[PDB]
């Protein structure tokens, strides 16, 4: 997970 993928995961909490 890169920058765009971590904020996405952190957002929905994966």
């Amino acid at each position, epitope marked *: 997970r890169d920058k*765009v993928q971590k*904020e996405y995961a952190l*957002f*929905y*909490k994966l």
Partner: antibody, heavy 122, light 109 residues
């Protein structure tokens, strides 16, 4: 590149109903599938979310504990199980897919379905 | 969360300019989680502006997004008849999203 939701119809107050969201052109592998309902002549309402990656589901307070989002990948499709229904649940239910685009735009609902209408009454 | 939208309806002429204000009850997770959707009757919504100020792929330059934190604004320039629809602001707040009440845009031709 297409989505279709099925299962809508007339249901009695308190009854249940399972809605489905099938894809026809893409897959639900490692992406978010969101459900958005819209009462007749009303505004959009975010209700539930589910990430097909590791089955992470989120629900709005209006459907807290009464609904359930499923992601049976068999024949790539997402489901929405509605338990104790009420008149307020009458609306057109959409499903949207994220990650279709590239970059930050992928966060948002890129691909939508035509919507399935659910009517709750006696 | 609550994204109070203003106005609820606006009447503007072809080529004019319309402004829609979206006030959020609390700060969004970040400016990368605030978009604007265009919806016409009988159709599903359509993404118009993402990241609060980025023009979605395929959207004309007439649409501009601005704001941050909790106050956002949508601006439609050179209003055309094809822009006749209802516009919603959706903001992400970590686990859930929140849609504004909507703003119907009528175009005088």
């Amino acid at each position: 590149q297409e989505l279709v939701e099925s299962g809508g119809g007339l249901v009695q107050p308190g009854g249940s109903l399972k809605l489905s969201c099938k894809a026809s052109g893409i897959d639900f592998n490692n992406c978010g599938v969101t459900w958005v309902r819209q009462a007749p002549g009303q505004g959009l309402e975010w209700i539930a979310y589910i990430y097909t990656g590791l089955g992470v589901g989120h629900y709005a307070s209006s459907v807290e504990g009464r609904f359930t989002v499923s992601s049976d990948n068999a024949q790539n499709a997402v489901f929405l199980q509605m338990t104790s229904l009420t008149a307020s649940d009458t609306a057109t239910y959409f499903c949207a897919r994220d990650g279709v685009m590239s970059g930050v735009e992928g966060y948002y609902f890129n691909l939508w379905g035509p919507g399935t209408l659910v009517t709750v009454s006696s | 969360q609550v994204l109070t939208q203003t106005p609820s309806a606006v009447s503007a002429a072809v080529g004019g300019t319309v402004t829609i204000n979206c006030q959020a009850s609390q700060s969004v997770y970040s400016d990368n989680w605030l978009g604007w959707y265009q919806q016409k009757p009988g159709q599903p919504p359509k993404l118009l502006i993402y990241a609060a100020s980025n023009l979605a792929s395929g959207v004309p330059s007439r649409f501009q997004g601005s704001g941050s934190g909790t106050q956002f604004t949508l601006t439609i320039s050179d209003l055309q008849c094809d822009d006749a629809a209802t516009y919603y602001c959706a903001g992400g707040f970590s686990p859930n999203w929140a849609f504004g009440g909507g703003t119907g845009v009528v175009v005088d031709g």
